[PDB]
Design a protein around this ligand. Structure first.
Ligand SMILES: OC[C@H]1O[C@H](O[C@H]2[C@H](O)[C@@H](O)[C@@H](O[C@H]3[C@H](O)[C@@H](O)[C@@H](O[C@H]4[C@H](O)[C@@H](O)[C@@H](O)O[C@@H]4CO)O[C@@H]3CO)O[C@@H]2CO)[C@H](O)[C@@H](O)[C@@H]1O
Ligand SMILES: OC[C@H]1O[C@H](O[C@H]2[C@H](O)[C@@H](O)[C@@H](O[C@H]3[C@H](O)[C@@H](O)[C@@H](O[C@H]4[C@H](O)[C@@H](O)[C@@H](O)O[C@@H]4CO)O[C@@H]3CO)O[C@@H]2CO)[C@H](O)[C@@H](O)[C@@H]1O
Lengths: 145, 611, 69
């Protein structure tokens, strides 16, 4: 809103021919929207997006707890756990699986048991670098090319 | 001898920079028009909320010589005096359109003076104060601090006359003190409801036998006596006493024992709002995903009714609404009508997000749209390529996906479209669900009024009803707010402001107000003050029926008519009532100097009397 | 226009559950737009798009004339 307001003002000026371009009105609402982003001190960006129906026992959470990847600024890899299928119509990650995969850079599928592994295979068919294993069927198959 | 023409304004309320009530909205939406008038003479005062203030306040340094014009210097010295003595506050701008200046007292910083104060209150106004009531402790702490602050200013400032406006009992305690200590400010007290009012209407009768209850005994009965006293005390110590609406001024007069000198109806920032077809189409998409597998009615011949607001079953008249719809359903069947009413209840409740069922409907109907679209563009390519090369268009490939997508819409035999979109966290005890069960509106094909309960706020990013409330509202045809206890009723008013006809009642404040300005303008007003409960419901159905019949022209007239009632509710118009009240406060405070400014003795019995 | 008409018809059917999909109305306007593409017999698609202010002398045209493309 604020920028298109600026556009109108720059254009109107120009077309008429013959320095704060943000009026006070616009500085207020900008300043409000910036402050609402403030987070409660020492709060870190969560490692999980959902309410876990068994927070304490969950294998994934507990493992990332055990390695203490807690998303603090010092940490150079961040951790996001999304315990639900992806759907384009979600408030959080508005992507279909196929969209989300394409937007990523590298898929990591360190499988121990996996007679084929359709997940890596279809990752690759959408043109995305991927790490599988040699106990994965798709891995084994790839290893012979 | 001070200047009435060039006076100060101090507006005090528990809500200044924390949305804990609907008053937050009133003050926030009134800012732009009063800040326009008073510039930096105007301050809002309120209790500092240590959890939120950082998101809403541009914190200022109040010591810098620049922080105040020279004439407004007195307030600055005033504040220092205050910090010297150990009272900690936050001075700043409240980041809302208008950016009014704000003083936010830290109730912890003064919590010591507590007991000295609960006492000093009792010994000048016999107001009790148990120690287990945090709200009243907080209201007393606030009261003493503000009277203090106003004392100082009254002292140090001698150029300006000082008016000080308080909203609601929680900010009322200053009011007696000001009168007791002959402080040189003129006070105003606005109540947006009464304590007895609310508590009396929280069971299931009022507007008739309210003028005959023993207030002292009834307050006692709810364990409310001390709160009641604070509310009365404030109402009598003010120089001008007011309420938001005519109907509330009736309940006020008999419950607090002082007849309001006037009414301060809540206006809106109309620009902030100001499409129907475009938005009605999003509601069409939802309805199709919801009635998938038994879509047997013509959307071009269906009307959307809605009720919205806080989940207050009795007071918002959610009961009257559902009842009247059941009765509108009969009338419509018997009359063998061709039209359909889909009625939404948007009132938030404990829920566990969307029902697996409702989520599926939308997804399968979305896949249909997708597949049809893919198939039609194929035909497009093929019809065109034929015409250009000159000299069953569906291949079987397309037939197959088409067939699959239509098969997915089939719904389990005998299963009906849900009356609710969410997982209820209390399916058994929910007042709304139970009422719609009692009347058996279950969305079967025979049923001419369908029913959709959406127990959650509307956000445009939802899988189900992808609208913001303001979007949804415009998409509709009629809003229905049969309220029983409602001092103002923003939801009706704002519904109207967006150009959508709406039914209110005469025990609503906004109703009462509208009633003095018939039905041709998009406002129907059911009578709950005079007709019996049943006659009332019946009048509702009369209004609904009448609206169902409206032809294309008859509706498109009404719509255009309400969209022009719009500009009546802007603060630009309503705010003149604040001016009437503030001026009356002056006239009563400095009777003599007022005659000099005006040129006679204008009448001072009420605000309308003056002007 | 014609195809989106078809779309509406296919969708409405489907959403209601429980072969010429082009009505006559649509066949007429299709047939008209196809015929307006007919070119005057033996007319070939021009080798040039503009009115030449010196058609006869122009080097480019004359060269492509000489090679009879
Ligand atoms: O009304 C006549 C007086 O009016 C003018 O006095 C000033 C005082 O000079 C100020 O000091 C101040 O008084 C404040 C007071 O400072 C403040 O602490 C608070 O006092 C309360 C106390 O908190 C409460 O617990 C209880 O004990 O009552 C006290 C008041 O009696 O509030 C006081 C009032 O605001 O501001 C006033 C404003 O009038 C004038 O200068 C005096 O000469 C004159 O007598
Ligand atoms: O038409 C077939 C059936 O007819 C009868 O079923 C009725 C029920 O009797 C009605 O009470 C109602 O059922 C509602 C239910 O009342 C309502 O609470 C809601 O159920 C939600 C639930 O709240 C939510 O938390 C979650 O679990 O999803 C549920 C829905 O899937 O909505 C129900 C459906 O409107 O309406 C039905 C018919 O639709 C008869 O009793 C049935 O035996 C018969 O099959």
């Amino acid at each position: 809103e604020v920028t298109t307001s600026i556009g109108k003002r720059i254009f109107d000026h120009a077309i008429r021919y013959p320095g704060e371009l943000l009026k006070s009105s616009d500085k207020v609402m900008l300043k409000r929207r910036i402050l609402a982003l403030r987070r409660p001190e020492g709060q870190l960006p969560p490692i999980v997006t959902h309410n876990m129906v068994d927070d304490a026992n969950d294998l994934i959470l507990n493992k990332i707890r055990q390695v203490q990847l807690f998303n603090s600024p010092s940490d150079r890899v961040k951790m996001i756990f999304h315990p639900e299928f992806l759907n384009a119509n979600n408030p959080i990650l508005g992507l279909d699986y196929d969209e989300f995969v394409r937007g990523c850079h590298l898929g990591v599928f360190p499988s121990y048991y996996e007679p084929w592994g359709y997940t890596p295979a279809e990752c690759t068919v959408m043109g995305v670098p991927s790490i599988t294993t040699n106990v994965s069927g798709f891995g084994s198959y790839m290893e012979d090319l | 001898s001070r200047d009435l023409q060039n006076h100060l304004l101090f507006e005090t309320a528990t809500e200044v920079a924390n949305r804990v009530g609907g008053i937050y909205s009133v003050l926030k939406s009134k800012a732009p028009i009063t800040v326009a008038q008073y510039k930096d003479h105007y301050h809002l005062i309120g209790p500092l909320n240590k959890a939120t203030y950082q998101n809403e306040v541009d914190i200022l340094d109040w010591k810098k010589p620049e922080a105040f014009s020279d004439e407004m210097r007195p307030v600055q010295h005033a504040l220092q005096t205050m910090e010297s003595r150990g009272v900690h506050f936050v001075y700043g701008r409240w980041l809302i359109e208008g950016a009014p200046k704000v003083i936010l007292f830290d109730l912890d910083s003064v919590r010591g003076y507590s007991n000295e104060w609960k006492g000093d209150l009792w010994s000048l106004v016999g107001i009790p104060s148990p120690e287990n009531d945090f709200e009243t402790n907080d209201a007393i702490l606030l009261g003493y601090t503000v009277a203090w602050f106003l004392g100082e200013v009254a002292h140090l400032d001698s150029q300006h006359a000082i008016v000080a406006h308080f909203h609601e009992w929680l900010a009322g305690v200053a009011l007696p003190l000001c009168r007791k200590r002959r402080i040189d400010v003129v006070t105003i007290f606005t109540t947006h409801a009464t304590l007895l009012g609310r508590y009396l209407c929280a069971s299931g009768d009022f507007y008739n036998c309210l003028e005959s209850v023993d207030v002292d005994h009834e307050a006692g009965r709810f364990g409310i006596y001390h709160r009641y006293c604070i509310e009365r005390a404030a109402a009598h110590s003010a120089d001008v006493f007011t309420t938001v609406s005519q109907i509330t001024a009736f309940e006020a007069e008999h419950l607090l024992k002082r007849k309001p000198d006037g009414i301060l109806p809540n206006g809106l920032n109309v620009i902030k709002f100001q499409l129907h077809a475009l938005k009605k189409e999003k509601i069409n998409d939802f309805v199709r995903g919801h009635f998938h597998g038994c879509f047997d009615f013509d959307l071009d011949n269906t009307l959307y009714f809605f009720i919205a607001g806080r989940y207050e079953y009795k007071n918002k008249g959610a009961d009257m609404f559902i009842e009247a719809l059941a009765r509108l359903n009969y009338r419509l069947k018997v009359s063998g009508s061709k039209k359909t009413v889909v009625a939404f209840i948007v009132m938030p409740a404990k829920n566990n997000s969307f029902t697996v069922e409702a989520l599926k409907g939308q997804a399968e109907v979305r896949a249909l749209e997708n597949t049809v679209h893919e198939v039609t563009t194929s035909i497009g390519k093929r019809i065109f390529d034929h015409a250009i090369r000159y000299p069953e268009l569906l291949k079987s490939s397309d037939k197959v996906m088409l067939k699959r997508r239509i098969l997915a819409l089939r719904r389990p035999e005998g299963q009906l479209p849900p009356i609710v979109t969410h997982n209820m966290v209390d399916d058994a005890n929910d007042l709304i669900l139970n009422k719609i069960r009692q009347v058996q509106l279950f969305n079967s094909p025979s049923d001419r009024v369908k029913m959709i309960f959406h127990p959650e706020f509307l956000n445009a990013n939802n899988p189900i009803l992808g609208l913001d409330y303001d979007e949804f509202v415009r998409g509709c045809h009629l809003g229905v707010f049969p309220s029983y206890y409602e001092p103002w009723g923003y939801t009706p008013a704002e519904c109207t402001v967006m150009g959508v006809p709406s039914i209110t009642t005469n025990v609503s404040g906004f109703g009462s107000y509208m009633e003095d300005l018939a039905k041709d303008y998009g406002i129907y007003i059911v009578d709950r003050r005079f007709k019996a409960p049943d006659e009332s419901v019946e009048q509702l159905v009369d209004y609904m029926e009448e609206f169902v019949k409206k032809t294309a022209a008859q509706a498109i007239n009404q719509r255009n008519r309400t969209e022009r009632l719009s500009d009546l509710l802007d603060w630009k118009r309503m705010g003149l009532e604040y001016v009437k009240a503030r001026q009356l406060a002056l006239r009563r405070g400095y009777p003599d100097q007022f005659r000099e400014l005006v040129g006679e003795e204008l009448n001072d019995s009420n605000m309308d009397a003056l002007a």
